[PDB]
Design a protein around this ligand. Structure first.
Ligand SMILES: [Mn+2]
Ligand SMILES: [Mn+2]
Lengths: 379, 379
């Protein structure tokens, strides 16, 4: 039959691509809910007009003032929509902190959660894992989606290593001396339209890969010491699984997020025609090289945070947010992003306790932000 | 509760590596029978001693005399060994036409057939298939083993294409003109897979790949026009499956036959430590290029033979053996191998009838050998 889908974060890159997948596959999917922030109210109102979906949520009460007929508006709007909407799949593509409560609400409904929101795993950690039942969470991002597919190649007991691929960013192969000179623009500071500035920077700093490694541990239950990273500049192989016999299973496709989005929505069932396959009529090469961990320690630091447990990965990510924003503002140089992450993290052992509530996670983040601000300013 | 394994062709490369896997894993496997040609008695005595297996077949009667206490001797010894030995797995690594009757005997016993002898499937065609239960035939060959693992990546209805990798051989990139002067010495080295003169020649001519395309169609039931070949000089990717969503799932390992051997013996269970894994702490590249089907038509000829069906793939294989022997003996040039296969297939009208008995298959090969010899006499 047809899967009933709630799209949370409908105006962002993931949400709008998921809506296209859904529009191209009305045999497979129907939209039954849409939630957005308020900054792109006009897009949401157009989405309402195009889909006929009236079940909509706007987080920003002020933005909601511009319209007289939104069923859910205000801070908890997306949570309330999830709580009150019958659905088979909740796509959580909200950004940051506001993704966390809707994730928990979605898990409670017993819907499948197609999860794009990183905050939910990286910050919400054991809160989210304790709430989720086996297989309930399906990851949306390309590396995790690749892993989910490759894990089909054997039983859970047969897994030796998970290997995430990394593009290496713009500074792949750069020395520590080279990194001193990095400008915001070089690191991907462009007023690009659909995505925030953080995602290309996190790629360059290798912090994105650290976050992905942490999410991998939480998603697949594999120890950090069995989660490896390889640099693969073509981004054709999206990740790999090495099994106990020595066999490695890899997932490969030309970069296109509609592939992992379609599979997350249809899981376990593939969606015909989602993306173009690899073409072997033209010669190509797929290159692998090790990450220089002396120059890029962000993944090693992510493993340290993840191994420490509790709210430590929330600390890692919040320290990053602050430091990275400071680099983009010209308050620090590029190498100091991961320098500041490390300094905050090493100070943060009080946060290794497991959180009981969302407030607990929020408190660790608050602490980490302030600690990173002091590192940045010298105060 | 270990698996009882009969090893046929025990003194060749696959047989000895199979014995290593079994010796390494006495928990999982035990040898209960050995069969050999009699050309390498030094190895066979050694194997009898180490395994404690006296249940042995020797093909050459003179070699069997020279040994002693051999319960099965003569041209039918391997087949009778199979019929009279209680076992869970028959590993058929016999060479060429010798493998067919033991394959049929093995299937009739109900044991798993771990098939290294591709000739028995290629020639046997539908006769071999009708004798097998679903999943009874488990391929030893690196490409098919990779395919079987990759197929776990989705349901049968989700398969778009099977992609076989080929090394390209020593003459990858050469012109038709350049192949004229090829010697048996030049055709005798293989870049990644160390093997005997016949298997090495077949990788050079691309006939091995054609035979593998046929085996793929018979094993997995995928149409010839959905079985692709890509040249991959490194032989690290051993094959790939493309699914209907655009995702490709690939299997990779450093070349080492103990991996597919170990999987074939203990299917579906992976054998811990069978082989070294790909090492992603060191740089590498995996290169792909299209096959030059002008200079190398052996794969298209295989598809044409396969599509015709019946005893035509037996014709394809038997013509190759005769032309290949003439080449190695210095009677014909290298291009003439595949030229003769083409000439023979063009004349093989009556061989599209499906084989009812082994005698039909043998009749087809007999005719093909003669027609191949006629083609040699003409040049
Ligand atoms: Mn990613
Ligand atoms: Mn092969």
């Amino acid at each position: 039959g047809r899967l009933r889908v709630v799209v949370l974060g409908s105006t962002g890159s993931i949400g709008t691509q998921a809506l296209q997948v859904i529009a191209d596959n009305p045999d497979r999917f129907e939209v039954v809910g849409l939630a957005a922030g308020g900054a792109h109210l006009d897009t949401l109102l157009r989405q309402r007009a195009q889909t006929g979906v009236t079940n909509i949520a706007v987080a920003d009460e002020h933005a909601a003032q511009r319209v007289g007929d939104i069923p859910y508006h205000g801070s908890d709007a997306a949570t309330r929509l999830v709580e009150q909407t019958e659905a088979d799949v909740v796509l959580n593509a909200l950004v940051g902190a506001l993704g966390l409560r809707p994730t928990l609400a979605a898990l409670k409904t017993g819907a499948r959660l197609a999860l794009a929101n990183k905050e939910s795993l990286v910050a919400g950690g054991s809160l989210v894992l304790r709430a989720a039942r086996p297989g309930q969470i399906v990851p949306v991002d390309s590396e995790h989606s690749a892993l989910a597919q490759c894990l089909r190649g054997g039983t859970p007991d047969e897994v030796a290593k998970l290997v995430l691929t990394a593009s290496g960013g713009p500074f792949r192969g750069w020395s520590a001396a080279d990194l001193e000179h990095v400008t915001p623009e070089q690191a991907g500071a462009h007023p690009t339209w659909s995505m925030g500035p953080m995602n290309t920077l996190n790629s360059a700093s290798l912090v994105n890969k650290g976050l992905e490694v942490i999410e991998t541990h939480l998603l697949f239950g594999i120890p950090y010491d069995r989660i490896d990273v390889v640099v693969h500049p073509q981004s054709i192989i999206h990740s790999m699984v090495t099994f106990i016999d020595g066999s490695t299973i890899a997932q490969a496709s030309p970069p296109d997020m509609k592939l992992p989005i379609s599979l997350a929505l249809g899981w376990p069932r593939r969606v015909s025609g989602a993306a173009a396959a690899c073409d072997f009529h033209t010669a190509s090469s797929w290159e692998f090289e090790p990450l220089d961990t002396d120059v890029f320690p962000a993944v090693e630091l992510a493993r340290q945070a993840g191994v420490a447990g509790g709210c430590m990965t929330a600390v890692y990510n919040a320290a990053n947010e602050e430091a990275a924003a400071a680099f983009l503002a010209g308050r620090i140089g590029f190498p100091a992003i991961v320098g500041i992450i490390a300094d905050v993290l090493h100070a943060a052992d009080q946060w290794a306790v497991e959180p009981a509530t969302v407030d607990d996670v929020l408190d660790a983040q608050r602490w980490a932000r302030e600690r990173a601000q002091r590192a940045v300013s010298g105060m």
